[PDB]
Amino acid sequence: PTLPPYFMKGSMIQLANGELKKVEDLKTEDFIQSAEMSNDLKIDSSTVERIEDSHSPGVAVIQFAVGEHRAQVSVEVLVEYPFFVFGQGWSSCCPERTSQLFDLPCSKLSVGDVCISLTLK
């Protein structure tokens, strides 16, 4: 896949209620509150069950257990793609590269980390 420009430090992110915040300052509650505020999107916990790094040049394959039922979902992303872990924030495969490329402090995504994902409601 590819990488969008909104993970870049200083990127203005508009929360559900209209409030503006820099992407580096986003917290778990900002997402939780935004899902509540929204009339169509809700938050779904996605737990990382396995990370199969170096699938191909610059890509990792992550296997999640999405939502209540825990449906096995595997996805393919550029190593520097950051997920937002509940109570932890931006987390990727290569924190170092995500930080260098995005100037975003970042954790090491790990088996067991519950990520924030979305589904219609």
Partner: peptide
């Protein structure tokens, strides 16, 4: 005045 802004729902995947 106006500025380019990204919505919060772009930062999180639809797994």
């Amino acid at each position: 005045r106006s500025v380019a802004v990204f919505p919060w729902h772009s930062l999180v995947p639809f797994l």
